[PDB]
Enzyme design. Structure first.
Site, PDB file in Angstrom:
ATOM      1  N   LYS A  80      -7.412 -10.850  42.548  1.00  0.00           N
ATOM      2  CA  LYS A  80      -6.766  -9.513  42.481  1.00  0.00           C
ATOM      3  C   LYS A  80      -7.583  -8.598  41.561  1.00  0.00           C
ATOM      4  O   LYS A  80      -7.562  -7.372  41.786  1.00  0.00           O
ATOM      5  CB  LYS A  80      -5.322  -9.642  41.985  1.00  0.00           C
ATOM      6  CG  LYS A  80      -5.152 -10.376  40.662  1.00  0.00           C
ATOM      7  CD  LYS A  80      -3.767 -10.231  40.069  1.00  0.00           C
ATOM      8  CE  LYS A  80      -2.965 -11.514  40.111  1.00  0.00           C
ATOM      9  NZ  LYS A  80      -3.131 -12.306  38.869  1.00  0.00           N
TER      10      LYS A  80
ATOM     11  N   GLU B 129      -3.531  -7.853  30.523  1.00  0.00           N
ATOM     12  CA  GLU B 129      -4.640  -8.602  31.083  1.00  0.00           C
ATOM     13  C   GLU B 129      -5.549  -9.094  29.965  1.00  0.00           C
ATOM     14  O   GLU B 129      -5.221  -8.986  28.786  1.00  0.00           O
ATOM     15  CB  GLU B 129      -5.382  -7.747  32.108  1.00  0.00           C
ATOM     16  CG  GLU B 129      -4.824  -7.920  33.488  1.00  0.00           C
ATOM     17  CD  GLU B 129      -4.595  -9.378  33.814  1.00  0.00           C
ATOM     18  OE1 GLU B 129      -5.587 -10.131  33.909  1.00  0.00           O
ATOM     19  OE2 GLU B 129      -3.422  -9.779  33.957  1.00  0.00           O
ATOM     20  N   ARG B 130      -6.681  -9.692  30.348  1.00  0.00           N
ATOM     21  CA  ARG B 130      -7.628 -10.279  29.359  1.00  0.00           C
ATOM     22  C   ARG B 130      -8.411  -9.178  28.632  1.00  0.00           C
ATOM     23  O   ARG B 130      -8.943  -8.281  29.315  1.00  0.00           O
ATOM     24  CB  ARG B 130      -8.582 -11.255  30.053  1.00  0.00           C
ATOM     25  CG  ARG B 130      -7.882 -12.377  30.809  1.00  0.00           C
ATOM     26  CD  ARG B 130      -8.833 -13.153  31.701  1.00  0.00           C
ATOM     27  NE  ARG B 130      -8.196 -14.310  32.314  1.00  0.00           N
ATOM     28  CZ  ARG B 130      -8.313 -14.643  33.595  1.00  0.00           C
ATOM     29  NH1 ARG B 130      -9.049 -13.903  34.406  1.00  0.00           N
ATOM     30  NH2 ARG B 130      -7.696 -15.713  34.059  1.00  0.00           N
TER      31      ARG B 130
HETATM   32  N1  LIG Z   1     -14.459 -11.293  45.983  1.00  0.00           N
HETATM   33  C1  LIG Z   1     -14.676 -12.528  45.539  1.00  0.00           C
HETATM   34  N2  LIG Z   1     -15.816 -13.161  45.905  1.00  0.00           N
HETATM   35  C2  LIG Z   1     -16.029 -14.404  45.456  1.00  0.00           C
HETATM   36  N3  LIG Z   1     -15.266 -15.158  44.669  1.00  0.00           N
HETATM   37  C3  LIG Z   1     -14.144 -14.506  44.321  1.00  0.00           C
HETATM   38  C4  LIG Z   1     -13.786 -13.228  44.703  1.00  0.00           C
HETATM   39  N4  LIG Z   1     -12.559 -12.885  44.152  1.00  0.00           N
HETATM   40  C5  LIG Z   1     -12.206 -13.940  43.463  1.00  0.00           C
HETATM   41  N5  LIG Z   1     -13.122 -14.960  43.522  1.00  0.00           N
HETATM   42  C6  LIG Z   1     -13.023 -16.259  42.867  1.00  0.00           C
HETATM   43  O1  LIG Z   1     -11.707 -16.420  42.388  1.00  0.00           O
HETATM   44  C7  LIG Z   1     -11.665 -16.209  40.952  1.00  0.00           C
HETATM   45  C8  LIG Z   1     -10.561 -15.233  40.628  1.00  0.00           C
HETATM   46  O2  LIG Z   1     -10.928 -14.465  39.453  1.00  0.00           O
HETATM   47  P1  LIG Z   1     -10.054 -13.173  39.078  1.00  0.00           P
HETATM   48  O3  LIG Z   1     -10.101 -12.198  40.207  1.00  0.00           O
HETATM   49  O4  LIG Z   1     -10.434 -12.698  37.715  1.00  0.00           O
HETATM   50  O5  LIG Z   1      -8.582 -13.810  39.010  1.00  0.00           O
HETATM   51  P2  LIG Z   1      -7.108 -13.155  39.052  1.00  0.00           P
HETATM   52  O6  LIG Z   1      -6.815 -12.887  40.508  1.00  0.00           O
HETATM   53  O7  LIG Z   1      -6.180 -14.182  38.450  1.00  0.00           O
HETATM   54  O8  LIG Z   1      -7.191 -11.892  38.232  1.00  0.00           O
HETATM   55  C9  LIG Z   1     -13.083 -15.775  40.558  1.00  0.00           C
HETATM   56  O9  LIG Z   1     -13.435 -16.267  39.271  1.00  0.00           O
HETATM   57  C10 LIG Z   1     -13.939 -16.410  41.657  1.00  0.00           C
HETATM   58  O10 LIG Z   1     -14.245 -17.763  41.398  1.00  0.00           O
HETATM   59 MG   LIG Z   2      -6.423 -10.546  36.288  1.00  0.00          MG
END
Ligand SMILES: Nc1ncnc2c1ncn2[C@@H]1O[C@H](COP(=O)(O)OP(=O)(O)O)[C@@H](O)[C@H]1O
Ligand SMILES: [Mg+2]
Ligand SMILES: Nc1ncnc2c1ncn2[C@@H]1O[C@H](COP(=O)(O)OP(=O)(O)OP(=O)(O)O)[C@@H](O)[C@H]1O
Ligand SMILES: [Mg+2]
Lengths: 421, 50, 542, 141, 53
Positions: free
Chosen positions: C157, C183-184
């Site tokens: 997200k 968030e972080r």
């Molecule tokens: N667009 C993307 N392309 C490749 N890997 C992705 C993508 N979005 C998320 N990921 C993977 O999933 C993880 C989700 O990270 P992040 O988006 O920060 O988490 P959250 O949804 O909890 O905020 C990433 O560290 C990566 O490993």
């Molecule tokens: Mg997040």
């Protein structure tokens, strides 16, 4: 009974006198070596450093684990979750990191050393005592603080032992040095905080946890930061540990810490009982902050390693078990099984990073294709022993596989006596 | 035909034993969440009165 | 001077009760505690009776004594608003936390408003292209609408909301606002350093040309700060919408932390809990905040909010309440991400009010409903393919499975913000290239190509160029035998003189952590305070 | 809009305004039923009136029940919907037909407010999200 | 449900007749006692009914 106020917020002794000492969740030592001498008192509840106080994670923290330092690379200032079932090697990964810092601290300069803190929340007191014997017979206890609120200790002591051990670890971060904090069994602390919350008659939420059980772990883990250059430049690296039930990672506390930490190390229970130890789930374990803070050369050869292990998981469990065999991708099935056996590793033996990337260069380039899969752990142990030790000083000092070095690497890798074959 | 059906039905018991093993844990999580949910509904209704 | 000053009555965590002897402040009014270690702002939440108000602190309450003087400001939390907040980071109470000096405010606006009225609502459904294939086709985004990204802790997200900043904020002519709610703090420093090198945020004398205001109430803050920092982020965006007349972008990284932090304080406000453990005022707290983020007749706010689903439960009451406040929901799935498909958008759970043939045209609409038709038909076969395999399906249903296995790889796309950790460069796909690319897989124009040729490519041009590369490379096993010959005397010296040209670093024994350490003398006996306040040891009684 | 009244207690309104808006709109629609005309009322998001009524009763410190709803949340919707009737010839012959709308969560028809209004209303129009994506619009089960 | 039963108990006892008592949704007797149960000051039993179900 008379209650006296001490005059100050809840504080633990922090400083250089905490190294070598086993400590309860409140600051007083339990190893029976006298009071903490060269120490001073700081609060266990400190607000985490803000946005300007931090900088980008640039320097690598070598774990000593081959499946970690190649695939899930971890930088200084990162928070990396170790998540998996019970007895899947959660500590096997955390205490290989502490032991490997003892080997690295004797070779790096003074301002590059990593001082470890191990918080044991809700553990057996015997396993804490068997761990101090491990850290003493290795010499890792010189750079290690040990905080322990065991299973017989009170629930406010297990609630506060991560915050006590983080404040002892925030001494090194705030003074320009580098810290490494490990909260063994992160879920445990939340169970001890659930106990205090229900006994305070607070309204329970999901899985009877309080509403501020996210804030229990978000407040704790945001204090692991890589500080800016006007704050000493020190870092603090967190390794929270979460135990899942039947591999369910959609749990409340599990998804809480996943949405707090930067990456995860999913340790699968199916690979652990199939002999693959450390049982790193390579598809689910990510680290997108310490990927920029990776050892180059290892970054050169593990880009091929996780790309070949990616297509190895396309031949996962239907090699011929599902319908049939095609015998054209027989090569990747007899190479992904070699990269799997390459990353297996015995306990309490962390490898230096310059000797890990040669073992992956020996595997990803194809110097072990002749070796059968039964004798690869014997082959790569024969690779590091028979290749001359001058090449490890070049790869450590240059920090990358230079085009002068891979010529002499491929020269030294063709004159090793691999077992069998 | 009889020997490829013998292998296609071994792959069906393995698939309907992996589906059953995964759905048992899905029921057990929904079983544990159910006893926790209605018990919280009883305490919240009792703390409003007591 | 004794009046208009209350004293702290009782402190229960983040909730502080203050007793005002003369006159009580209004609800939502802000207070100031005298003599705290930091600037502790309380916001009055309830009049409890017996001349006591109930307040929520904006910082930590540790160190509060139950006699501390609390001053009424006579107003709610007022934050600096205007173009002087561009390129600045503010916290929940409007203080600059970017160390760039004070904020040159055009005005000091309260963070509490009523929603804009029914006569000030705009009905203009214009599309906003994002360059994302699963977004532009199946759930298109409105140019002045509310957008939700629903996610389950690790499904992507934040990478999706950073790609939306990478795609539509540079092409926007107005001002962006980022409300980082819960968030972080590492991500708030990552976004700040990325927006400085990109020229979105300029420092010093060039600060007036900045196009983004950061408001950060991250997850290291107490729940009072995380419950009102979304209201601070709207107030900067509401000034550009109302007063400046601009088109505003508002990015709210996890709006669920507004709902979660209101549940951490509601346990201590003495309320009976609602369903799963949230506050009884879930729908009216979220509805009071989300109704202020609208396109009015004098300005548009294109809001993109991330919504965290708490245990991958979409039926949880905090994500379920948010679904009714949005024009386009983008539900991300944990199971799509485990297939490696990124962005992990569920095509049969993401909806939009723009997916209507009288808004996006009947040619774009009929393709999206055809993509959702064969993806639902593949989901209806998901257990027959599991327990019996694909050999039991019809020959008209194995064409349904193979086409739907192709488009769910073709909904995948590499991002320009994911190129750092994936290595593959980002792909911006135009809108007409997505509708034409998804016509071909539905009609059957690309049944020749394999399934994995569609994986992580931008356009339908790039699946043909990857289908060639997958068959040049299996013919490249018979290509050549590479020998590296006669290089040892060209430019590579040796191994032994390579050791002599390394630089030895001095290893220092006696690490010396006693430098700049003061080491106060902690004695054995527990030092306590007697009745006269002096530090004495414990008496010898129990 | 020549024949339509619109009562809108939106999400920013207070909880007793969303609780009272189905009764406010039914009283406006009861003018046509009680004068020989014919009404048609749509209580869109009647699943959101019960959440607004739950907020008042939990904050009036009435003890919660199933999913923390009040005990009389059946009577909240039964006395509202029974006002939609077809009157006799001695009362004008006018009518009032109701279309309440209940939103379920992941198709769970067995929810608490969902099973109340099913037992109150005459018919049901079930709309499934899996028939909606097969091209069947309206997604009538 | 007690009002209609009292009419059926008069035809059984005093008139001595055979009675047919049709009760449409005796569930609503138990449901209506649940709608007043928390307001009578009873803490709730299982699924949401009164303790005296
Ligand atoms: N667009 C993307 N392309 C490749 N890997 C992705 C993508 N979005 C998320 N990921 C993977 O999933 C993880 C989700 O990270 P992040 O988006 O920060 O988490 P959250 O949804 O909890 O905020 C990433 O560290 C990566 O490993
Ligand atoms: Mg997040
Ligand atoms: N790389 C390895 N090679 C061999 N054995 C290993 C390895 N890593 C761990 N083990 C063994 O696996 C077992 C698991 O113990 P460990 O403490 O690592 O697991 P854990 O997940 O912490 O378990 P618990 O939930 O009981 O704390 C131990 O016997 C340990 O020695
Ligand atoms: Mg352990």
């Amino acid at each position: 009974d008379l209650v006296y106020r001490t005059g100050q917020i809840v504080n633990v002794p922090i400083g250089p006198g905490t190294l070598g000492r086993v400590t309860d969740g409140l600051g007083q030592p339990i190893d029976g070596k006298g009071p903490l001498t060269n120490v001073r008192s700081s609060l266990v509840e400190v607000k985490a450093p803000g946005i300007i106080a931090r900088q980008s994670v640039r320097e690598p923290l070598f774990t000593g684990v081959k499946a970690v330092d190649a695939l899930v690379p971890i930088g200084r200032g990162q928070r990396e979750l170790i998540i998996g079932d019970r007895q899947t090697g959660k500590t096997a990964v955390a205490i290989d990191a502490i032991i490997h810092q003892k080997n690295c601290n004797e070779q790096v300069p003074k301002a590059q050393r990593v001082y470890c803190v191990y918080v044991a929340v809700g553990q057996k007191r015997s396993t804490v005592a068997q761990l101090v014997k491990l850290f003493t017979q290795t010499g890792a206890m010189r750079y290690t603080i040990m905080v322990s609120a065991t299973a017989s200790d009170a629930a406010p002591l297990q609630f506060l032992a991560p915050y006590s051990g983080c404040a002892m670890a925030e001494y090194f971060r705030d003074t320009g040095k580098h810290g490494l904090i490990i909260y063994d069994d992160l879920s445990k602390q939340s169970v001890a905080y659930r106990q205090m919350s229900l006994l305070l008659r607070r309204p329970p939420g999901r899985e009877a946890f309080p509403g501020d059980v996210f804030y229990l772990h978000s407040r704790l883990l945001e204090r692991a930061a890589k500080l800016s250059k006007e704050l000493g430049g020190g870092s603090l690296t967190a390794f929270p540990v979460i135990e899942t039930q039947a591999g369910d990672v959609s749990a409340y506390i599990a998804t809480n810490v996943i949405s707090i930490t930067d990456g995860q190390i999913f340790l699968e229970t199916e690979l652990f009982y199939k002999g693959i130890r450390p049982a790193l789930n390579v598809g689910l374990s990510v680290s997108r902050v310490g990927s920029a803070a990776q050892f180059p050369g290892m970054k050169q050869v593990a880009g091929t390693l996780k790309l070949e292990l990616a297509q190895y998981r396309e031949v996962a469990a239907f090699a011929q078990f599902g319908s049939d065999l095609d015998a054209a991708t027989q090569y990747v099935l007899e190479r992904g099984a070699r990269l799997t056996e390459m990353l297996k590793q015995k306990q309490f033996a962390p490898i230096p990073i310059e000797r890990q990337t040669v073992a992956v260069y020996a595997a990803t380039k194809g110097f072990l294709d002749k070796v059968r899969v039964q004798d690869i752990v014997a082959a790569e142990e024969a690779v590091i022993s028979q290749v001359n030790p001058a090449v490890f000083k070049i790869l450590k000092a240059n920090g990358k596989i230079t085009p002068a070095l891979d010529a002499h690497l491929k020269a030294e890798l063709r004159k090793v006596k691999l077992p069998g074959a | 035909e009889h020997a490829s059906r013998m292998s296609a039905m071994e792959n069906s018991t393995k698939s309907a034993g992996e589906m059953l093993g995964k759905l048992t844990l899905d029921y057990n999580r929904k079983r544990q969440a159910t006893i926790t949910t209605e018990l919280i509904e009883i305490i919240a209704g009792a703390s409003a009165l007591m | 001077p004794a009046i208009d000053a209350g004293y702290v009555s009782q402190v229960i965590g983040p909730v502080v009760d203050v007793r005002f002897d003369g006159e009580l402040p209004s609800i939502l009014s802000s207070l100031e505690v005298e003599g705290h270690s930091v600037r502790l702002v309380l916001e009055v939440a309830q009049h409890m009776g017996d001349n006591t108000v109930r307040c929520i602190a904006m910082d930590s309450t540790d160190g509060l004594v139950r006699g501390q003087k609390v001053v009424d400001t006579g107003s709610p939390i007022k934050v600096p608003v205007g173009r002087g907040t561009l390129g600045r980071i503010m916290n929940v109470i409007g203080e600059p936390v970017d160390e760039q000096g004070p904020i040159d405010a055009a005005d000091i606006w309260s963070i509490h408003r009523e929603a804009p009225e029914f006569t000030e609502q705009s009905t203009e459904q214009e599309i906003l292209v994002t360059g994302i294939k699963v977004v532009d086709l199946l759930a298109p985004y409105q140019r002045g609408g509310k957008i939700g990204l629903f996610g389950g802790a690790g499904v992507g997200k934040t990478v999706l909301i950073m790609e939306l900043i990478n795609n539509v904020a540079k092409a926007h002519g107005g001002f962006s606002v980022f409300a980082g709610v819960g968030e972080r703090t590492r991500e708030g420093n990552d976004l700040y350093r990325e927006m400085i090198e990109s020229g979105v945020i300029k420092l010093g004398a060039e600060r007036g040309n900045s196009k983004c205001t950061l408001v950060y109430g991250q997850m290291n803050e107490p729940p009072g700060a995380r419950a009102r920092v979304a209201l601070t982020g709207l107030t900067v965006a509401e000034y550009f919408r109302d007063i400046e007349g601009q088109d505003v972008l508002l990015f709210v990284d996890n709006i669920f932390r507004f709902t979660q932090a209101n549940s951490e304080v509601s346990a201590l406000l003495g309320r009976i809990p609602s369903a799963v453990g949230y506050q009884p005022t879930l729908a009216t707290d979220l509805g009071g905040l989300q109704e202020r983020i609208t396109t009015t007749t004098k300005g548009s706010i294109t809001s993109v909010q991330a919504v965290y689903v708490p245990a991958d439960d979409l039926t949880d009451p905090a994500p379920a309440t948010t679904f009714a406040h949005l024009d386009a929901t983008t539900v991300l799935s944990r199971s799509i991400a485990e297939l490696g498909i990124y962005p992990a958008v569920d095509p049969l759970d993401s909806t939009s009010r723009m997916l209507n043939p009288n808004v996006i045209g009947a040619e774009h609409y009929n393709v999206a409903r055809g993509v959702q038709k064969v993806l639902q038909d593949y989901k209806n076969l998901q257990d027959i393919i599991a327990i019996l395999g694909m050999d039991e399906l019809s020959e008209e249903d194995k064409l349904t499975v193979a086409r739907a296995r192709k488009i769910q790889r073709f909904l995948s796309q590499p991002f320009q913000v994911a190129e750092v950790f994936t290595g593959t460069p980002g792909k911006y796909v135009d809108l007409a290239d997505t509708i034409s690319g998804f016509q071909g897989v539905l009609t059957g124009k690309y049944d020749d190509l394999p399934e994995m040729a569609f994986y992580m490519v931008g356009d339908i041009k790039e699946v043909k160029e990857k289908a060639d590369k997958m068959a040049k490379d299996i013919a490249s096993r018979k290509e050549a035998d590479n020998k590296k010959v006669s290089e040892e005397l060209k430019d590579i010296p040796s191994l032994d003189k390579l050791v002599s040209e390394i630089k030895e670093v001095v290893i220092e024994e006696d690490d010396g952590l006693e430098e700049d350490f003061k080491a106060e003398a902690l004695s054995s006996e527990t030092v306590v305070l007697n009745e006269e306040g002096k530090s004495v040891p414990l008496p010898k009684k129990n």
